[PDB]
Design a protein around this ligand. Structure first.
Ligand code: K
Ligand code: K
Ligand code: K
Ligand code: K
Ligand code: K
Length: 194
């Protein structure tokens, strides 16, 4: 019972970071494949991230402090960036390869790393500002990134292509009111009886 997950309260919405991300084959019904992989990888909770650019599952375990109904912060940010792209190499365009770090309302930071529109396996992390920046710089060294998207203060880091962005800018809304999309929610991975 590691209980490493701590909910992120953003207004009325309860988000989580730290899912394990698994790209799917695209050869089988995506949900059924995701369920099979969850059993093998030993996770009892999942979210599906599906659109024209991605077919992936984000996984967690109840024993690690995650729960059905927790909203995937990664799912939200991933889709938001899929929708708006980013400015890099002289134009606003889709950004398949992006990294970012965002300040959270309680002082923690979220770190994201996405390649070919899909999260890297551990590219969804929440913790201290210092460790988030450390992870950011570490993945950045690999190269092949379109853009760094995140907290405006990261301007100062001197990344080649930087896109300032706050989580608040990305949340979908009803006028001023944040909307929750149901698909962000972790749901139980159904298992047959033995
Ligand atoms: K994976
Ligand atoms: K796979
Ligand atoms: K494949
Ligand atoms: K997440
Ligand atoms: K995406």
């Amino acid at each position: 019972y590691t209980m490493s997950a701590q909910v992120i309260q953003i207004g009325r919405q309860r988000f989580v970071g730290g899912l394990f991300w698994q790209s799917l084959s695209r050869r089988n019904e995506l949900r059924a494949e995701a369920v099979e992989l969850a059993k093998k990888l030993k996770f009892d909770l999942m979210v599906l991230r599906i659109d024209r650019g991605v077919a992936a599952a984000g996984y967690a375990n109840t024993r690690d402090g995650f729960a059905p109904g927790h909203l995937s912060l990664g799912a939200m940010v991933s889709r938001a960036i899929a929708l708006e792209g980013a400015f890099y190499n002289g134009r606003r365009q889709p950004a398949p390869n992006w990294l970012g770090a965002f300040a959270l309302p309680d002082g923690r930071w979220a770190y994201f790393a996405v390649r070919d529109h899909a999260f890297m396996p551990n590219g969804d992390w929440v913790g201290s500002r210092e460790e988030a920046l450390e992870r950011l710089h570490t993945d950045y060294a690999w190269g092949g990134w379109n853009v760094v998207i995140g907290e405006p203060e990261l301007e100062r880091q001197g990344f080649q292509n930087f896109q300032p962005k706050r989580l608040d800018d990305l949340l979908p809304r009803r006028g001023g009111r944040p909307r929750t999309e149901r698909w962000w929610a972790l749901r139980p991975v159904e298992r047959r009886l033995s």
